C-alpha cells in the first residue's frame, strides 16, 4: 500500500529532523553556547508529533548502538518493525562517532522522545520507568547545557505524574532538584521547576505553602516568556486567594499579555476566567471582547452571565447562575472567589456611583444601591473608601460624599514617575540588545 | 439600471411580518402576497409559510409550482437550442436568464449555483460585474454575511482590474448598505455621502430612503464641522429633505441645538428604525449614541450647568436626565461629573496637554509591550 | 430672500457685538452682557453656547452661578503631537521588525 510508503516518508523526514536537532546539540556542546540547546528544545515540540513506534525504534537503533545498558532499557519498551524491504541503515554515527559515549544532550533528547511518545500512547506506567531512568542518569551530570534539556524533561516528568494522579511521591524530588538548580545558579531549570512545584501546590490546594515559597524564592527574570506567563498566572491565583486582589489583577494581566499569542487555548482560557473573576472582585467591569473571541466564547459564557448579573445588580440572577453553572466553577477552581464576589457585589455599585457622581448624598447612594438604611450606606461607602476602591470622603455633619477633587496630574510628579519607569525600561532594553550582539569568531 | 430582482421590498415586508407588533398586520400581508402572486414565487412562499407558520393555499401553491416548472422547462429548451445552433453568447444569455428566474422565484441555493455556473462560463467583464452584483443583491436579500463579503471582495477586485464609474458607484452604494448592516456607521456615512449626488442604484431603494439612511448615518458618524459642511449645507440632501419635513427637523434640531425637538424627533426616528429591515439590530445602539452625542454637544459649551437646565433644554424631568447622565458617565462616554446635592453637572474635559499625555502613555505602553515581546522573542 | 439674508446679517451683528463687549471682561455674567446688548438672557446664553461650540471666541459658560469665562487657548504643544506621531511611526517600525525576525 502506498499509504504505508508515505508514512515511511514522513517518518524519515522526522528522522532527518531529529538528526538536525542532535547535530545542533553537539554544536552547542562544542561551541560553548547554550542558545543552540534552546533552539533544539524550541524545535522539540514541533517534532513531538509526526512520530510512531518505528520512528523511535530507528532513532534508538541509529544513535546509541554502543551496547550500553541504554539499549537494554529503551528497546523493550517499544515495538519493532519487521524485515522491511527498505532496510536503509540510518547511522549518523560512523565508527569513532559511535565509539565515543553519547553526550548527555543527545541521550537525554532521545530518551525524552521515548517518554513523550510513550505518553502519546497513553500508557503512563511504561513511560514512568523510562522517566525515572532518564532522571537517574541526568542527576549526576553537572553539564550546564544539559540543565536546559534537563529543565524540559523536568516539566515532562511532572506531566506524566499528572496522568498518574499522584503528584506527591515526587514533590520532595522536585524540591531537591529546584534547590540543586538554585545552587547551580541556573535560570531556565529554576524557573520551570518553580512553575511545576507551584502547579503541584495548587493542584493539592496548598496555597499557603505556595505563598511562602514565592515570598522566599525569586523567579529568574531571564527566563522563557512561557515560563514567565505560567509563573505569573500561578502568582496571580495566589494573590487572588490571599485577598491581594489588585496585585493579582496586575499579575494576571501581565500573564495574559505574555501569553503565546495564539498557541495555548486552555491556558489563555483559564487566565481569562481568573482575571475576569478577580477584576469583578475589584469592582471593575472587564472587557466585553473577552467573551466574543472565537476560542473563548463558550468557555467564558458562564462568566459572561456572571458579569451581566453583577453589573445589572440582580443578585437573584447571581444566585441563579450559581445554581446552574456555578458547579462548573468548582471544576475551574474558582468557586470560593465566586462566593466572595457574591458577597462583594455592592463594591461595583459603589465604584459606579463614585465614577458618575461627585457629591452624591448618603440617602441617594442608598436609594441607588438598594441599601435599606442610610447608615448602612455610610458603613459601605466608608469601607470602600478605606479599602482603596473609592476616592471620596463623607461629610458626616450633613451626610454628603465629596469625592477627592481631581488635580492637574501633569502639574504633579506623577507624569515624571511614569516617564521614569518608561525610560528605565527603554534603556534596559537598549542595554540588553547591545549587550549580546553575538559577533561570531 | 440594474434589475430590481430580487426585490428588497419583499425582504423588508417579510421582516416587518416577523416583527411582533406587525405580525398581526394585514396590509403588509396583502402587499407581500400581491408581490408573490405577481412574481409567482413558490419556494420563498414555502419558506415564508414555514417560518411564520402560515396556512398554505394549496391551489395557489400548485399553480405557482406548475408555472415555475413550465417556465424552467422553457429556459432549458432555449439553452439547449442555443447550445445546438448558436454560439457561446446565446447559451450564456440563456443561463443568465435561468439564474435570474431562479432568483426571481425565490430559490436561494438554486439561484446561487446557477449564477456561479454562469460566472464560470462568463467572460465579458461587464457581465461578470453584473453577475457579482446579482449575487450581492441575493446576499443582501437573505442577509448572508459570508456571501455579501465574498461578493463584495470579488466586485472590488473586478473593478480594480477594469471598473467603469457607474459600477463603482453602485458598488459604493452596496458597500454602504452592508456597512449599515454591520453597524460600521463611519464607513457607511462615508460611502453614502460620496454617492448621494450620483445615486443610481434605484433597485436597492428609492432616493428618499437612501437619503434618510444617509442623514441618519452621517449624523451618527460625522462630527459637528463635517456634519455642517457636508449634510447641513448639502445641496442634494437639502433638496430632497424639502420633501421630508420629519427627517429635516430631526437633522436640524441637533445642529441648531434645539434639544427638546431633537429628542422628540429621535424618538420618531427610533420608531422608524425599529421597523426597518436593515437598521433592525442597531436601533438601540443608534439611539444611545445619539443621546450621548446630544449630551456631549450640550456639555461642550458649559463648564458647570444645573440639572434643571438640561431638563428644560431636552424637555425632560430632572430624574431622567440624571439617570441617563449617570449611566453614560459610568460607561465613560461623557467628560463630566454630577453634584446631586446642588444638582450641578461639572465638565471634566482634559486640557490639550493632559489628553496628549494620556494618549502618549497609552500608545507608548502598547509600543513598549510590543518591543518587550519582540526582544524576548529574538534574544533567546 | 430678504428674510434669510436679514436673519444672517442679524446673527453676524449679534456675534460681532458679543465679541466687542467680551474683550474687556474675563468672568462677566450673562445678565450684564444681556443688559449691554439689550436682548433676553436666554437668547444671549444660547448664542454664546453656539459660538463656544462652533470653536468661535474661546470660553466656557458656568450656568451654576452665571458666568462666561475667557482664556487664551494654549497652543497644542507641538512637541507632544510630534511625539505621538513618532510613537505611531515606530509602532509601524516594530510591526516591520515583526515581519523580519521570522528568519530566526
Amino acid at each position: 500500500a502506498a499509504a504505508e510508503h508515505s508514512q515511511r516518508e514522513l517518518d524519515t523526514v522526522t528522522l532527518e529532523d531529529i538528526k538536525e536537532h542532535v547535530k545542533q546539540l553537539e554544536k552547542a556542546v562544542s561551541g560553548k553556547e547554550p542558545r543552540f540547546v534552546l533552539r533544539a528544545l524550541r524545535m522539540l515540540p514541533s517534532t513531538s508529533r509526526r512520530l510512531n513506534h518505528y520512528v523511535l525504534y530507528k532513532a534508538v537503533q541509529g544513535f546509541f548502538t554502543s551496547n550500553n545498558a541504554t539499549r537494554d532499557f529503551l528497546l523493550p519498551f517499544l515495538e519493532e518493525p519487521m524485515d522491511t524491504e527498505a532496510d536503509l541503515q540510518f547511522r549518523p554515527r560512523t565508527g569513532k562517532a559511535a565509539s565515543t559515549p553519547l553526550l548527555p544532550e543527545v541521550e537525554a533528547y532521545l530518551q525524552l522522545l521515548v517518554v513523550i511518545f510513550m505518553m502519546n500512547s497513553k500508557r503512563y506506567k511504561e513511560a514512568q520507568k523510562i522517566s525515572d531512568d532518564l532522571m537517574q542518569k541526568i542527576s549526576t551530570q553537572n553539564r550546564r547545557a544539559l540543565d536546559l534539556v534537563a529543565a524540559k524533561c523536568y516539566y515532562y516528568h511532572a506531566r506524566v505524574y499528572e496522568f498518574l494522579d499522584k503528584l506527591d511521591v515526587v514533590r520532595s524530588f522536585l524540591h531537591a532538584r529546584l534547590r540543586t538548580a538554585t545552587l547551580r545558579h541556573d535560570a531556565d531549570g529554576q524557573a520551570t521547576l518553580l512553575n511545576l512545584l507551584l502547579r503541584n501546590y495548587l493542584h493539592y490546594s496548598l496555597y499557603d505553602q505556595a505563598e511562602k515559597l514565592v515570598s522566599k524564592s525569586v523567579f529568574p527574570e531571564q527566563a522563557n516568556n512561557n515560563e514567565w506567563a505560567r509563573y505569573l498566572y500561578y502568582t496571580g491565583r495566589i494573590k487572588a486567594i490571599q485577598l491581594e486582589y489588585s496585585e493579582a489583577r496586575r499579575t494576571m494581566t501581565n500573564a495574559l499579555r505574555k501569553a503565546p499569542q495564539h498557541t495555548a487555548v486552555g491556558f489563555k482560557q483559564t487566565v481569562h476566567k481568573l482575571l475576569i473573576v478577580v477584576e469583578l472582585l475589584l469592582g471593575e467591569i472587564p472587557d466585553r471582547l473577552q467573551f466574543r473571541q472565537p476560542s473563548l466564547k463558550r468557555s467564558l459564557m458562564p462568566y459572561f452571565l456572571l458579569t451581566q448579573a453583577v453589573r445589572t445588580g440582580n443578585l437573584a440572577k447571581f444566585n441563579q447562575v450559581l445554581d446552574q453553572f456555578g458547579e462548573k466553577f468548582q471544576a475551574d477552581g474558582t468557586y470560593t472567589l465566586i462566593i466572595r464576589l457574591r458577597h462583594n457585589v455592592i463594591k461595583t455599585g459603589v465604584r459606579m456611583i463614585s465614577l458618575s457622581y461627585s457629591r452624591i448624598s448618603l440617602a441617594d447612594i442608598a436609594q441607588k444601591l438598594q441599601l435599606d438604611s442610610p447608615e448602612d450606606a455610610e458603613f459601605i461607602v466608608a469601607k470602600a473608601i478605606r479599602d482603596g476602591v473609592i476616592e471620596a470622603s463623607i461629610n458626616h455633619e450633613k451626610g454628603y460624599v465629596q469625592s477627592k477633587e481631581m488635580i492637574d496630574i501633569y502639574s504633579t510628579r506623577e507624569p515624571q514617575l511614569a516617564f521614569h519607569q518608561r525610560i528605565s525600561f527603554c534603556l534596559d532594553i537598549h542595554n540588553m540588545s547591545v549587550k549580546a550582539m553575538r559577533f561570531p569568531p | 439600471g440594474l434589475p430590481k430582482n430580487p426585490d428588497l421590498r419583499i425582504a423588508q415586508l417579510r421582516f416587518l411580518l416577523s416583527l411582533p407588533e406587525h405580525r398581526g398586520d394585514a396590509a403588509v400581508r396583502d402587499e407581500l402576497m400581491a408581490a408573490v402572486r405577481d412574481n409567482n414565487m413558490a419556494p420563498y412562499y414555502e419558506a415564508l409559510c414555514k417560518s411564520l407558520d402560515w396556512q398554505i393555499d394549496v391551489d395557489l401553491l400548485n399553480k405557482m409550482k406548475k408555472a415555475n416548472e413550465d417556465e424552467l422547462k422553457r429556459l432549458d429548451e432555449e439553452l439547449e437550442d442555443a447550445e445546438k445552433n448558436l454560439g457561446e453568447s446565446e447559451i450564456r444569455d440563456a443561463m443568465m436568464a435561468k439564474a435570474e428566474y431562479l432568483c426571481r422565484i425565490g430559490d436561494k441555493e438554486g439561484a446561487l449555483t446557477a449564477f456561479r455556473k454562469t460566472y464560470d462560463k462568463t467572460v465579458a467583464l461587464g457581465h461578470r460585474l453584473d453577475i457579482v452584483f446579482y449575487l450581492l443583491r441575493i446576499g443582501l436579500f437573505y442577509m448572508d454575511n459570508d456571501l455579501i463579503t465574498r461578493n463584495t471582495e470579488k466586485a472590488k477586485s473586478l473593478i480594480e482590474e477594469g471598473g467603469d464609474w457607474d459600477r463603482r458607484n453602485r458598488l459604493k452604494v452596496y458597500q454602504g448598505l452592508y456597512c449599515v448592516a454591520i453597524r460600521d456607521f463611519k464607513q457607511a456615512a462615508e460611502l453614502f455621502l460620496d454617492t448621494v449626488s450620483t445615486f443610481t442604484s434605484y433597485e436597492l431603494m428609492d432616493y428618499k430612503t437612501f437619503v434618510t439612511y444617509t442623514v441618519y448615518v452621517s449624523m451618527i458618524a460625522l462630527e459637528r464641522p463635517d456634519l455642517r459642511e457636508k449634510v447641513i449645507k448639502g445641496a442634494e440632501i437639502l433638496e430632497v429633505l424639502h420633501s421630508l419635513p420629519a427627517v429635516r427637523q430631526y437633522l436640524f434640531s441637533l445642529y441648531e441645538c434645539r434639544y427638546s425637538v431633537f429628542f422628540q424627533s429621535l424618538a420618531v426616528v427610533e420608531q422608524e428604525m425599529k421597523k426597518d429591515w436593515l437598521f433592525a439590530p442597531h436601533y438601540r445602539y443608534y439611539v444611545r449614541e445619539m443621546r450621548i452625542h446630544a449630551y456631549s454637544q450640550l456639555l461642550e459649551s458649559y463648564r458647570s450647568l444645573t440639572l434643571g437646565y438640561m431638563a428644560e433644554a431636552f424637555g425632560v424631568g430632572v430624574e431622567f436626565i440624571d439617570q441617563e447622565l449617570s449611566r453614560f458617565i459610568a460607561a465613560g462616554r461623557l467628560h463630566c461629573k454630577i453634584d446631586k446635592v446642588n444638582e450641578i453637572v461639572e465638565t471634566n474635559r482634559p486640557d490639550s496637554k493632559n489628553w496628549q499625555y494620556q494618549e502618549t502613555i497609552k500608545k507608548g505602553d502598547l509600543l513598549l509591550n510590543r518591543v518587550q515581546k519582540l526582544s524576548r522573542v529574538i534574544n533567546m | 430672500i430678504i428674510s434669510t439674508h436679514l436673519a444672517k446679517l442679524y446673527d453676524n451683528l449679534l456675534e460681532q457685538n458679543l465679541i466687542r463687549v467680551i474683550e474687556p471682561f474675563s468672568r462677566v455674567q450673562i445678565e450684564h452682557i444681556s443688559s449691554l446688548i439689550k436682548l433676553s438672557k436666554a437668547d444671549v446664553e444660547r448664542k454664546l453656547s453656539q459660538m463656544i461650540l462652533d470653536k468661535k471666541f474661546h470660553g466656557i459658560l458656568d450656568q451654576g452661578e452665571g458666568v462666561l469665562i475667557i482664556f487664551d487657548e494654549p497652543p497644542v504643544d507641538k512637541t507632544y503631537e510630534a511625539a505621538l506621531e513618532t510613537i505611531q511611526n515606530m509602532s509601524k517600525v516594530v510591526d516591520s521588525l515583526y515581519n523580519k525576525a521570522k528568519k530566526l
Binding site: 547591545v434 | 507608548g364 | 525576525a101 530566526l104
Partner: peptide, 30 residues
C-alpha cells in the same frame, strides 16, 4: 522618553539584523 524609545527600537533592529547576518554566514558556510 521619546528619544530613549527611539534608541531602544534602533538597538533592537540592529540586534535583529546582526542575528540574521550571523545565521546567514553560518548557513552559507556549509
Amino acid at each position: 522618553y521619546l528619544a530613549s524609545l527611539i534608541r531602544s527600537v534602533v538597538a533592537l533592529h540592529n540586534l535583529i539584523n546582526n542575528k540574521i547576518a550571523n545565521r546567514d554566514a553560518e548557513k552559507k558556510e556549509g
